[PDB]
Design a protein around this ligand. Structure first.
Ligand SMILES: [Mg+2]
Ligand SMILES: [Mg+2]
Ligand SMILES: [Mg+2]
Ligand SMILES: [Mg+2]
Ligand SMILES: [Mg+2]
Ligand SMILES: [Mg+2]
Ligand SMILES: [Mg+2]
Ligand SMILES: [Mg+2]
Ligand SMILES: [Mg+2]
Ligand SMILES: [Mg+2]
Ligand SMILES: [Mg+2]
Ligand SMILES: [Mg+2]
Ligand SMILES: [Mg+2]
Ligand SMILES: [Mg+2]
Ligand SMILES: [Mg+2]
Ligand SMILES: [Mg+2]
Ligand SMILES: [Mg+2]
Ligand SMILES: [Mg+2]
Ligand SMILES: [Mg+2]
Ligand SMILES: [Mg+2]
Ligand SMILES: [Mg+2]
Ligand SMILES: [Mg+2]
Ligand SMILES: [Mg+2]
Ligand SMILES: [Mg+2]
Ligand SMILES: [Mg+2]
Ligand SMILES: [Mg+2]
Ligand SMILES: [Mg+2]
Ligand SMILES: [Mg+2]
Ligand SMILES: [Mg+2]
Ligand SMILES: [Mg+2]
Ligand SMILES: [Mg+2]
Ligand SMILES: [Mg+2]
Ligand SMILES: [Mg+2]
Ligand SMILES: [Mg+2]
Ligand SMILES: [Mg+2]
Ligand SMILES: [Mg+2]
Ligand SMILES: [Mg+2]
Ligand SMILES: [Mg+2]
Ligand SMILES: [Mg+2]
Ligand SMILES: [Mg+2]
Ligand SMILES: [Mg+2]
Ligand SMILES: [Mg+2]
Ligand SMILES: [Mg+2]
Ligand SMILES: [Mg+2]
Ligand SMILES: [Mg+2]
Ligand SMILES: [Mg+2]
Ligand SMILES: [Mg+2]
Ligand SMILES: [Mg+2]
Ligand SMILES: [Mg+2]
Ligand SMILES: [Mg+2]
Ligand SMILES: [Mg+2]
Ligand SMILES: [Mg+2]
Ligand SMILES: [Mg+2]
Ligand SMILES: [Mg+2]
Ligand SMILES: [Mg+2]
Ligand SMILES: [Mg+2]
Ligand SMILES: [Mg+2]
Ligand SMILES: [Mg+2]
Ligand SMILES: [Mg+2]
Ligand SMILES: [Mg+2]
Ligand SMILES: [Mg+2]
Ligand SMILES: [Mg+2]
Ligand SMILES: [Mg+2]
Ligand SMILES: [Mg+2]
Ligand SMILES: [Mg+2]
Ligand SMILES: [Mg+2]
Ligand SMILES: [Mg+2]
Ligand SMILES: [Mg+2]
Ligand SMILES: [Mg+2]
Ligand SMILES: [Mg+2]
Ligand SMILES: [Mg+2]
Ligand SMILES: [Mg+2]
Ligand SMILES: [Mg+2]
Ligand SMILES: [Mg+2]
Ligand SMILES: [Mg+2]
Ligand SMILES: [Mg+2]
Ligand SMILES: [Mg+2]
Ligand SMILES: [Mg+2]
Ligand SMILES: [Mg+2]
Ligand SMILES: [Mg+2]
Ligand SMILES: [Mg+2]
Ligand SMILES: [Mg+2]
Ligand SMILES: [Mg+2]
Ligand SMILES: [Mg+2]
Ligand SMILES: [Mg+2]
Ligand SMILES: [Mg+2]
Ligand SMILES: [Mg+2]
Ligand SMILES: [Mg+2]
Ligand SMILES: [Mg+2]
Ligand SMILES: [Mg+2]
Ligand SMILES: [Mg+2]
Ligand SMILES: [Mg+2]
Ligand SMILES: [Mg+2]
Ligand SMILES: [Mg+2]
Ligand SMILES: [Mg+2]
Ligand SMILES: [Mg+2]
Ligand SMILES: [Mg+2]
Ligand SMILES: [Mg+2]
Ligand SMILES: [Mg+2]
Ligand SMILES: [Mg+2]
Ligand SMILES: [Mg+2]
Ligand SMILES: [Mg+2]
Ligand SMILES: [Mg+2]
Ligand SMILES: [Mg+2]
Ligand SMILES: [Mg+2]
Ligand SMILES: [Mg+2]
Ligand SMILES: [Mg+2]
Ligand SMILES: [Mg+2]
Ligand SMILES: [Mg+2]
Ligand SMILES: [Mg+2]
Ligand SMILES: [Mg+2]
Ligand SMILES: [Mg+2]
Ligand SMILES: [Mg+2]
Ligand SMILES: [Mg+2]
Ligand SMILES: [Mg+2]
Ligand SMILES: [Mg+2]
Ligand SMILES: [Mg+2]
Ligand SMILES: [Mg+2]
Ligand SMILES: [Mg+2]
Ligand SMILES: [Mg+2]
Ligand SMILES: [Mg+2]
Ligand SMILES: [Mg+2]
Ligand SMILES: [Mg+2]
Ligand SMILES: [Mg+2]
Ligand SMILES: [Mg+2]
Ligand SMILES: [Mg+2]
Ligand SMILES: [Mg+2]
Ligand SMILES: [Mg+2]
Ligand SMILES: [Mg+2]
Ligand SMILES: [Mg+2]
Ligand SMILES: [Mg+2]
Ligand SMILES: [Mg+2]
Ligand SMILES: [Mg+2]
Ligand SMILES: [Mg+2]
Ligand SMILES: [Mg+2]
Ligand SMILES: [Mg+2]
Ligand SMILES: [Mg+2]
Ligand SMILES: [Mg+2]
Ligand SMILES: [Mg+2]
Ligand SMILES: [Mg+2]
Ligand SMILES: [Mg+2]
Ligand SMILES: [Mg+2]
Ligand SMILES: [Mg+2]
Ligand SMILES: [Mg+2]
Ligand SMILES: [Mg+2]
Ligand SMILES: [Mg+2]
Ligand SMILES: [Mg+2]
Ligand SMILES: [Mg+2]
Ligand SMILES: [Mg+2]
Ligand SMILES: [Mg+2]
Ligand SMILES: [Mg+2]
Ligand SMILES: [Mg+2]
Ligand SMILES: [Mg+2]
Ligand SMILES: [Mg+2]
Ligand SMILES: [Mg+2]
Ligand SMILES: [Mg+2]
Ligand SMILES: [Mg+2]
Ligand SMILES: [Mg+2]
Ligand SMILES: [Mg+2]
Ligand SMILES: [Mg+2]
Ligand SMILES: [Mg+2]
Ligand SMILES: [Mg+2]
Ligand SMILES: [Mg+2]
Ligand SMILES: [Mg+2]
Ligand SMILES: [Mg+2]
Ligand SMILES: [Mg+2]
Ligand SMILES: [Mg+2]
Ligand SMILES: [Mg+2]
Ligand SMILES: [Mg+2]
Ligand SMILES: [Mg+2]
Ligand SMILES: [Mg+2]
Ligand SMILES: [Mg+2]
Ligand SMILES: [Mg+2]
Ligand SMILES: [Mg+2]
Ligand SMILES: [Mg+2]
Ligand SMILES: [Mg+2]
Ligand SMILES: [Mg+2]
Ligand SMILES: [Mg+2]
Ligand SMILES: [Mg+2]
Ligand SMILES: [Mg+2]
Ligand SMILES: [Mg+2]
Ligand SMILES: [Mg+2]
Ligand SMILES: [Mg+2]
Ligand SMILES: [Mg+2]
Ligand SMILES: [Mg+2]
Ligand SMILES: [Mg+2]
Ligand SMILES: [Mg+2]
Ligand SMILES: [Mg+2]
Ligand SMILES: [Mg+2]
Ligand SMILES: [Mg+2]
Ligand SMILES: [Mg+2]
Ligand SMILES: [Mg+2]
Ligand SMILES: [Mg+2]
Ligand SMILES: [Mg+2]
Ligand SMILES: [Mg+2]
Ligand SMILES: [Mg+2]
Ligand SMILES: [Mg+2]
Ligand SMILES: [Mg+2]
Ligand SMILES: [Zn+2]
Lengths: 70, 95, 97, 107
RNA sequence: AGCCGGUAGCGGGCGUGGAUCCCUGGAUGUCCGAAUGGGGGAACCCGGCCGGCGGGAACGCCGGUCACCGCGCGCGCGGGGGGAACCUGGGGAACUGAAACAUCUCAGUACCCAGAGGAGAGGAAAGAGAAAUCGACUCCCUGAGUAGCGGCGAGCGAAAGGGGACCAGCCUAAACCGUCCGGCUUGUCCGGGCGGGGUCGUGGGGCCCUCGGACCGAAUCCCCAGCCUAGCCGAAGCUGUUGGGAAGCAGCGCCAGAGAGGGUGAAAGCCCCGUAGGCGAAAGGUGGGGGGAUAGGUGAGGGUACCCGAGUACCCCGUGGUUCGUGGAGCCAUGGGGGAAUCUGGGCGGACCACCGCCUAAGGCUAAGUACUCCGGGUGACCGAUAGCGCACCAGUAC
RNA sequence: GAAUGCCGGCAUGAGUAACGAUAAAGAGGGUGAGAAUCCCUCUCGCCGUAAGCCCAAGGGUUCCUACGCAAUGGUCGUCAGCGUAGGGUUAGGCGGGACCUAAGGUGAAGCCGAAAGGCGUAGCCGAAGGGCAGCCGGUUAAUAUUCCGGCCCUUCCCGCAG
RNA sequence: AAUCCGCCUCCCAACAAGCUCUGCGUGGUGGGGAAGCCCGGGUGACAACCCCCCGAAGCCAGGGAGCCAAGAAAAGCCUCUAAGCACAACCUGCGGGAACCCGUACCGCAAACCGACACAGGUGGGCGGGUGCAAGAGCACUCAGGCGCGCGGGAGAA
């Protein structure tokens, strides 16, 4: 993911509520599994995407954590 | 957080796993610590099906070496889920 | 053969020194040590049972500090001890040391 | 914390020593780990390649070899001379490389 | 200004809209391990309660909580295990030496156990010991291989004093006053908390008369300088020639608070990294120095004889410690027996007595000077792959 | 230059002993650069209270297939329990656990011991003992009381009826 | 505590039954199915699936008799009642739902375990066919299955 796209994700994410953050992760964790399946059948040439989602999910969860801490 | 997409990892791609599609038996690699009951709910919410029967087995990693360095592959666990009569998990029918 | 609950008296290590010959002070040639070996000297531990607040308290105490037990019972009078377990009472008494 | 490279991709440099002493060229690539830089058209060697899909007909190709970073001195875009680099503080106050013979910037 | 570790490749991305990378803080942190819900053949198994998920009552999963012990009015705080040496304490050998051996030695060593920390111990005289004297303790030099101890054998081996390092002194118990509580043998009663009070050896304190009525100041807390955990600036060289290569040689220069050193195709002050000299922290750690609070600290005569740490001092028996091996054997310590006193009290100055002096036991705390090196750095008339750590290399590995 | 020194290297004995049960071999065809040794056929011999088959220990991928022969195989090797890669182990009923106890182990209570620790009725743990519900066939290169087919059964939750 | 158990008395029953549990047989139904021939499979084949005899150390079983050396425990299970509660609860029948974790490959008298070795050694339980020999797990041959032992070819001295 591009640097600017990362700033933007954090901005938008920090605006969501915890419930929305949970839901958004559950979607990305799903989109990840799809990437894993296309990885196994040899149909994912843009393999960097697998890393991206994993770190997006991390960032999202990190922020979700921020919210719950007060 | 824990989701069904954390329990189902990859589909088992092999002659033996394919032969099960015909009678509606789908074979996935699952997280090694995952339960039959837990796998049931996981496959269902992922592929919108109805699981009737779950079989699991552990798959010890093969010992493998690279020159001087003897090692081992990660231990895996695979599950063979049974979908309700006439249902289909289409992602796997693929093939 | 153990440790005094009151005085803290513990078993100590002493030597047993065997000697022969006549003392110099008695015109002797002098005393010769024909053997030294380690031994233990135990406190004179004894059992002291006392009724305090309707409960039976027992102390394992050196004979030297036997009357120190009764002193503690006297000083226990200004305490609200009734209702407590015997294990509890003993703790109160010993705290007053 | 990081290797000190007084030169970068891709300012114009003079190769001051070795076989190609005198030559001038742009810095194609910088390799901080080997502490070496690739200078365009300098250090040409003949590498043999297997006849492959990539190289049908086979034979040899030509490759620019890395030069030790010290063998290279940047050419000042102001006075046009080979120089040492200096650090200068601006009002930003960012720091920039400036030529040592005159005062010109080197980016 | 490059980057996606060693690690290239296939296949794909990121970066002056500041990436990789470096320091600081934070978040995540499966299972075992003190391991602590319960069990267990560690990394596995099995539960209780509250909440959530699934169609969910059975079943399963996610979050939270549930061991035991100590101290304090079920709930709080604390404990548990680990650390290379270093340190105190509780126990404690033998080979060996005595050219045999038992006392003795080795040696309170090796080792085991408990414990403490960044140090531990000790520490504010019931001291020293002869100076009409010194003045807590610790550590070094010296006193001194002296004094002495010793099958007076082998051997063991102080202290006072002097020179230095560091520097610091405190809080209590008791008498008396007050307050809360409970005890039954009802009160000027006994007792337990808490507060006041008091802390000394020219003895000090209490109580009762008498006169007198701002200075010190922390070892605690607060701020700060300084330091540590990333870094940054940093002078002066070109040309010819041999050569694969110049830093060699030659010509003409230049810097220097920098001619330590390592690189660069060979031998470079001026190419590179550095060096002299400077600069640098938002964050965390430190902070013994600077500043400020706080706690705490402070008179003099006279009377009273109330108080000054108990199974203690003291004596005897058994022992340990000291240079002291039963010796004229004191001192310090204490397992057994006996067993006081409160300043006209008591301990000590090497049996004992007198005299003359010293000191204040039976409660506690206390920096620094000192030890060590797992860790980081600097430096070697230190090693250079049979060396140097067991390991320069995927070693506490293969075997 | 010697320490039956230490570490390593390389010699000698020497093309020598040996090549691990005297149950035993022979031919033809195939493969391949190479074949007494691998594959196939026929003939011959050996085991058969095993030298056959099924469990449990223990071992831990050696199982199956593809491609290989440097080393391992006491020879050879195209072969292999060897090298590389891919595949393969499916259970409410089988075994163990969510059941029970045995010796023993541990251990609230309690007892003892310089320290570490030693005991100890209950309880807990501890099995190849007690208890407990699946039999026949089919299928894979490789798993099956596990998948499939037929016919049976157990517990738990809930509901109805008596 | 107790209607249970134990003990005493009485009545009926008793080598009967009844009741209950297991074994074996049959059993709706499903399976298998040879030689030989032909390239593990196809065929044989609508395969046949029957009578007699031998017969266990195994089953009914917790059976019987004898003997002395006198031969585990606890749970599941049935019964009793106490707190409790009797709208509960439990039993019986039926129905639907629910049913977790680990092992499972392969060698296993051995070239895969213990013996440094693909080592003439060691390793517990079960199956272990046929004929003949008095019997047998002995012995000889042989079935199923498995092998000919991972150097060979010659020669015919001591
Ligand atoms: Mg980032
Ligand atoms: Mg998580
Ligand atoms: Mg297949
Ligand atoms: Mg689940
Ligand atoms: Mg469902
Ligand atoms: Mg499993
Ligand atoms: Mg399973
Ligand atoms: Mg790994
Ligand atoms: Mg004696
Ligand atoms: Mg004498
Ligand atoms: Mg005399
Ligand atoms: Mg003597
Ligand atoms: Mg006694
Ligand atoms: Mg008594
Ligand atoms: Mg005494
Ligand atoms: Mg006495
Ligand atoms: Mg040059
Ligand atoms: Mg030139
Ligand atoms: Mg990599
Ligand atoms: Mg590429
Ligand atoms: Mg690339
Ligand atoms: Mg920045
Ligand atoms: Mg960090
Ligand atoms: Mg997990
Ligand atoms: Mg635990
Ligand atoms: Mg839990
Ligand atoms: Mg436990
Ligand atoms: Mg719940
Ligand atoms: Mg639920
Ligand atoms: Mg949970
Ligand atoms: Mg401890
Ligand atoms: Mg500790
Ligand atoms: Mg000691
Ligand atoms: Mg102790
Ligand atoms: Mg001993
Ligand atoms: Mg000796
Ligand atoms: Mg010696
Ligand atoms: Mg010696
Ligand atoms: Mg000597
Ligand atoms: Mg000797
Ligand atoms: Mg001698
Ligand atoms: Mg001797
Ligand atoms: Mg000694
Ligand atoms: Mg010690
Ligand atoms: Mg400790
Ligand atoms: Mg200290
Ligand atoms: Mg220090
Ligand atoms: Mg004092
Ligand atoms: Mg002298
Ligand atoms: Mg002498
Ligand atoms: Mg000594
Ligand atoms: Mg001194
Ligand atoms: Mg001095
Ligand atoms: Mg100093
Ligand atoms: Mg002083
Ligand atoms: Mg009262
Ligand atoms: Mg009182
Ligand atoms: Mg009072
Ligand atoms: Mg009072
Ligand atoms: Mg006075
Ligand atoms: Mg203080
Ligand atoms: Mg610089
Ligand atoms: Mg410079
Ligand atoms: Mg030239
Ligand atoms: Mg030159
Ligand atoms: Mg010159
Ligand atoms: Mg210098
Ligand atoms: Mg130099
Ligand atoms: Mg140099
Ligand atoms: Mg020179
Ligand atoms: Mg030189
Ligand atoms: Mg140089
Ligand atoms: Mg400096
Ligand atoms: Mg500097
Ligand atoms: Mg006064
Ligand atoms: Mg008095
Ligand atoms: Mg005193
Ligand atoms: Mg006292
Ligand atoms: Mg005395
Ligand atoms: Mg004495
Ligand atoms: Mg002594
Ligand atoms: Mg003595
Ligand atoms: Mg003497
Ligand atoms: Mg003495
Ligand atoms: Mg004494
Ligand atoms: Mg005594
Ligand atoms: Mg006096
Ligand atoms: Mg006196
Ligand atoms: Mg004394
Ligand atoms: Mg005296
Ligand atoms: Mg004295
Ligand atoms: Mg006197
Ligand atoms: Mg004195
Ligand atoms: Mg200080
Ligand atoms: Mg100190
Ligand atoms: Mg030091
Ligand atoms: Mg160092
Ligand atoms: Mg050298
Ligand atoms: Mg050197
Ligand atoms: Mg070497
Ligand atoms: Mg070495
Ligand atoms: Mg060498
Ligand atoms: Mg090292
Ligand atoms: Mg080595
Ligand atoms: Mg010589
Ligand atoms: Mg030899
Ligand atoms: Mg020899
Ligand atoms: Mg010889
Ligand atoms: Mg040698
Ligand atoms: Mg030699
Ligand atoms: Mg040798
Ligand atoms: Mg010979
Ligand atoms: Mg011969
Ligand atoms: Mg031969
Ligand atoms: Mg042989
Ligand atoms: Mg042979
Ligand atoms: Mg024979
Ligand atoms: Mg042939
Ligand atoms: Mg042939
Ligand atoms: Mg062959
Ligand atoms: Mg061949
Ligand atoms: Mg037979
Ligand atoms: Mg096994
Ligand atoms: Mg093995
Ligand atoms: Mg292998
Ligand atoms: Mg297999
Ligand atoms: Mg294999
Ligand atoms: Mg093959
Ligand atoms: Mg080979
Ligand atoms: Mg070969
Ligand atoms: Mg070969
Ligand atoms: Mg070989
Ligand atoms: Mg070979
Ligand atoms: Mg061999
Ligand atoms: Mg094989
Ligand atoms: Mg293989
Ligand atoms: Mg395959
Ligand atoms: Mg089944
Ligand atoms: Mg359960
Ligand atoms: Mg259990
Ligand atoms: Mg049990
Ligand atoms: Mg025990
Ligand atoms: Mg206890
Ligand atoms: Mg027991
Ligand atoms: Mg239990
Ligand atoms: Mg059990
Ligand atoms: Mg069992
Ligand atoms: Mg059993
Ligand atoms: Mg079972
Ligand atoms: Mg079971
Ligand atoms: Mg059945
Ligand atoms: Mg098989
Ligand atoms: Mg079935
Ligand atoms: Mg009903
Ligand atoms: Mg009764
Ligand atoms: Mg009745
Ligand atoms: Mg009755
Ligand atoms: Mg039947
Ligand atoms: Mg039948
Ligand atoms: Mg029947
Ligand atoms: Mg049929
Ligand atoms: Mg057939
Ligand atoms: Mg046939
Ligand atoms: Mg047919
Ligand atoms: Mg026909
Ligand atoms: Mg017919
Ligand atoms: Mg029999
Ligand atoms: Mg019987
Ligand atoms: Mg029992
Ligand atoms: Mg029980
Ligand atoms: Mg009632
Ligand atoms: Mg479970
Ligand atoms: Mg299996
Ligand atoms: Mg099997
Ligand atoms: Mg087998
Ligand atoms: Mg055998
Ligand atoms: Mg057997
Ligand atoms: Mg076999
Ligand atoms: Mg085999
Ligand atoms: Mg052997
Ligand atoms: Mg073997
Ligand atoms: Mg061995
Ligand atoms: Mg082997
Ligand atoms: Mg063999
Ligand atoms: Mg064998
Ligand atoms: Mg046998
Ligand atoms: Mg027979
Ligand atoms: Mg005949
Ligand atoms: Mg017969
Ligand atoms: Mg015969
Ligand atoms: Mg016969
Ligand atoms: Mg025989
Ligand atoms: Mg036989
Ligand atoms: Mg025979
Ligand atoms: Mg045959
Ligand atoms: Mg053979
Ligand atoms: Mg052989
Ligand atoms: Mg052969
Ligand atoms: Zn310039």
């Amino acid at each position: 993911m591009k640097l600017s796209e990362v700033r933007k994700q954090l901005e938008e994410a920090r605006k969501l509520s915890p419930v929305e953050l949970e839901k958004l992760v559950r979607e990305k964790k799903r989109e990840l599994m799809e990437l894993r399946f296309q990885a196994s059948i040899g149909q994912l040439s843009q393999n960097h995407k697998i890393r991206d989602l994993k770190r997006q999910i991390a960032r999202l969860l990190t922020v979700l954590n921020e919210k719950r801490r007060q | 957080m824990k989701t069904a997409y954390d329990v189902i990892l990859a589909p088992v791609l092999s002659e033996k796993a394919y032969a099960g599609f015909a009678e509606g038996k789908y074979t996935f690699w699952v997280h090694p610590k995952a339960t039959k009951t837990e796998i049931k709910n996981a496959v269902e919410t992922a592929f919108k099906v109805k699981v009737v029967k779950v079989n699991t087995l552990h798959v010890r990693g093969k010992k493998k070496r690279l020159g001087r360095y003897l090692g081992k592959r990660p231990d895996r666990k695979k599950a063979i889920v049974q979908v309700a009569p006439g249902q289909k998990i289409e992602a796997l029918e693929g093939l | 053969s153990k440790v005094c609950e009151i005085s803290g008296k513990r078993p100590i290590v002493a030597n047993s020194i065997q000697r022969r010959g006549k003392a110099k002070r008695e015109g002797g040639v002098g005393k010769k040590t024909t053997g030294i070996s380690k031994r233990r000297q135990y406190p004179n531990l004894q059992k002291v049972r006392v009724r305090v607040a309707g409960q039976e308290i027992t102390f394992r105490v050196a004979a030297s500090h036997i009357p120190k037990v009764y002193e503690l019972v006297e000083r226990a009078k200004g305490l609200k001890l009734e209702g407590l377990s015997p294990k509890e009472i003993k703790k109160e008494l010993l705290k007053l040391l | 914390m990081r290797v000190k490279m007084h030169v970068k991709k891709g300012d114009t440099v003079l190769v001051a020593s070795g076989k190609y002493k005198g030559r001038v060229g742009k810095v194609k690539e910088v390799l901080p780990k080997k502490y070496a830089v690739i200078v365009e058209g300098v250090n040409i060697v003949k590498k043999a390649v297997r006849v492959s899909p990539k190289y049908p007909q086979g034979g040899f190709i030509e490759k620019e070899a890395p030069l030790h970073a010290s063998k290279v001195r940047p050419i000042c875009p102001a006075c046009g001379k080979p120089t040492r680099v200096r650090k200068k503080f601006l009002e930003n106050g960012k720091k920039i490389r400036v030529c040592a013979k005159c005062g010109g910037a080197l980016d």
